[PDB]
Structures are given as C-alpha cells and as structure tokens.
Amino acid sequence: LAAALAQAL
Ligand SMILES: *C(=O)c1ccc(-c2ccc(C(=O)OCC)cn2)nc1
Ligand SMILES: *NNC(=O)c1ccc(-c2ccc(C(N)=O)cn2)nc1
C-alpha cells in the first residue's frame, strides 16, 4: 500500500 502511494515521489 505504502509503495503504491509513494510512486508520486
Ligand atoms: C503497497 O503498496 C505494497 C506494495 C507491494 C508490496 C510487496 C510486498 C512484498 C513483496 C515481495 O516481493 O515480498 C517478498 C517476500 C512485493 N511487494 N507490499 C505493499
Ligand atoms: N517517486 N518515485 C520516483 O521518483 C522514483 C523512485 C525510484 C525510481 C527507480 C528507477 C530505477 C531503479 C532501478 N533501475 O533500480 C530504481 N528506482 N525511479 C523513480
């Protein structure tokens, strides 16, 4: 989950 969002960065 964290990674899925973190792609923005
Ligand atoms: C939430 O974005 C997210 C994405 C991907 C994963 C995840 C966990 C584990 C692996 C893996 O290769 O484990 C090997 C033991 C890959 N991707 N978790 C949470
Ligand atoms: N928000 N994330 C990025 O801007 C980003 C993170 C990681 C990477 C990237 C690209 C290529 C490799 C590799 N060849 O191992 C690893 N990580 N790009 C962009």
JSON list of C-alpha atoms and ligand atoms in Angstrom, two decimals:
[
{"chain": "A", "resi": 1, "resn": "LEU", "atom": "CA", "xyz": [0.00, 0.00, 0.00]},
{"chain": "A", "resi": 2, "resn": "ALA", "atom": "CA", "xyz": [2.71, 2.50, 1.05]},
{"chain": "A", "resi": 3, "resn": "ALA", "atom": "CA", "xyz": [4.64, 1.88, -2.19]},
{"chain": "A", "resi": 4, "resn": "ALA", "atom": "CA", "xyz": [1.51, 2.28, -4.33]},
{"chain": "A", "resi": 5, "resn": "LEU", "atom": "CA", "xyz": [1.15, 5.83, -2.99]},
{"chain": "A", "resi": 6, "resn": "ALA", "atom": "CA", "xyz": [4.88, 6.55, -2.72]},
{"chain": "A", "resi": 7, "resn": "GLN", "atom": "CA", "xyz": [5.27, 6.34, -6.51]},
{"chain": "A", "resi": 8, "resn": "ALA", "atom": "CA", "xyz": [4.34, 10.06, -6.54]},
{"chain": "A", "resi": 9, "resn": "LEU", "atom": "CA", "xyz": [7.86, 10.55, -5.04]},
{"chain": "B", "resi": 1, "resn": "LIG", "atom": "C1", "xyz": [1.65, -1.42, -1.13]},
{"chain": "B", "resi": 1, "resn": "LIG", "atom": "O1", "xyz": [1.81, -0.54, -1.92]},
{"chain": "B", "resi": 1, "resn": "LIG", "atom": "C2", "xyz": [2.51, -2.68, -1.22]},
{"chain": "B", "resi": 1, "resn": "LIG", "atom": "C3", "xyz": [3.04, -2.96, -2.46]},
{"chain": "B", "resi": 1, "resn": "LIG", "atom": "C4", "xyz": [3.86, -4.07, -2.58]},
{"chain": "B", "resi": 1, "resn": "LIG", "atom": "C5", "xyz": [4.08, -4.84, -1.50]},
{"chain": "B", "resi": 1, "resn": "LIG", "atom": "C6", "xyz": [5.02, -6.00, -1.71]},
{"chain": "B", "resi": 1, "resn": "LIG", "atom": "C7", "xyz": [5.35, -6.71, -0.61]},
{"chain": "B", "resi": 1, "resn": "LIG", "atom": "C8", "xyz": [6.24, -7.75, -0.74]},
{"chain": "B", "resi": 1, "resn": "LIG", "atom": "C9", "xyz": [6.79, -8.01, -1.98]},
{"chain": "B", "resi": 1, "resn": "LIG", "atom": "C10", "xyz": [7.82, -9.15, -2.11]},
{"chain": "B", "resi": 1, "resn": "LIG", "atom": "O2", "xyz": [8.47, -9.36, -3.07]},
{"chain": "B", "resi": 1, "resn": "LIG", "atom": "O3", "xyz": [7.95, -9.88, -0.91]},
{"chain": "B", "resi": 1, "resn": "LIG", "atom": "C11", "xyz": [8.96, -10.89, -0.94]},
{"chain": "B", "resi": 1, "resn": "LIG", "atom": "C12", "xyz": [8.86, -11.61, 0.42]},
{"chain": "B", "resi": 1, "resn": "LIG", "atom": "C13", "xyz": [6.45, -7.23, -3.06]},
{"chain": "B", "resi": 1, "resn": "LIG", "atom": "N1", "xyz": [5.59, -6.24, -2.88]},
{"chain": "B", "resi": 1, "resn": "LIG", "atom": "N2", "xyz": [3.57, -4.56, -0.30]},
{"chain": "B", "resi": 1, "resn": "LIG", "atom": "C14", "xyz": [2.78, -3.49, -0.13]},
{"chain": "B", "resi": 2, "resn": "LIG", "atom": "N1", "xyz": [8.51, 8.76, -6.58]},
{"chain": "B", "resi": 2, "resn": "LIG", "atom": "N2", "xyz": [9.42, 7.81, -7.03]},
{"chain": "B", "resi": 2, "resn": "LIG", "atom": "C1", "xyz": [10.39, 8.17, -8.01]},
{"chain": "B", "resi": 2, "resn": "LIG", "atom": "O1", "xyz": [10.50, 9.28, -8.44]},
{"chain": "B", "resi": 2, "resn": "LIG", "atom": "C2", "xyz": [11.29, 7.02, -8.40]},
{"chain": "B", "resi": 2, "resn": "LIG", "atom": "C3", "xyz": [11.70, 6.07, -7.47]},
{"chain": "B", "resi": 2, "resn": "LIG", "atom": "C4", "xyz": [12.55, 5.06, -7.89]},
{"chain": "B", "resi": 2, "resn": "LIG", "atom": "C5", "xyz": [12.95, 5.04, -9.22]},
{"chain": "B", "resi": 2, "resn": "LIG", "atom": "C6", "xyz": [13.87, 3.95, -9.68]},
{"chain": "B", "resi": 2, "resn": "LIG", "atom": "C7", "xyz": [14.22, 3.90, -11.00]},
{"chain": "B", "resi": 2, "resn": "LIG", "atom": "C8", "xyz": [15.06, 2.90, -11.42]},
{"chain": "B", "resi": 2, "resn": "LIG", "atom": "C9", "xyz": [15.51, 1.99, -10.46]},
{"chain": "B", "resi": 2, "resn": "LIG", "atom": "C10", "xyz": [16.41, 0.82, -10.81]},
{"chain": "B", "resi": 2, "resn": "LIG", "atom": "N3", "xyz": [16.78, 0.71, -12.17]},
{"chain": "B", "resi": 2, "resn": "LIG", "atom": "O2", "xyz": [16.77, 0.03, -10.00]},
{"chain": "B", "resi": 2, "resn": "LIG", "atom": "C11", "xyz": [15.14, 2.11, -9.15]},
{"chain": "B", "resi": 2, "resn": "LIG", "atom": "N4", "xyz": [14.34, 3.09, -8.79]},
{"chain": "B", "resi": 2, "resn": "LIG", "atom": "N5", "xyz": [12.52, 5.95, -10.08]},
{"chain": "B", "resi": 2, "resn": "LIG", "atom": "C12", "xyz": [11.72, 6.93, -9.71]}
]
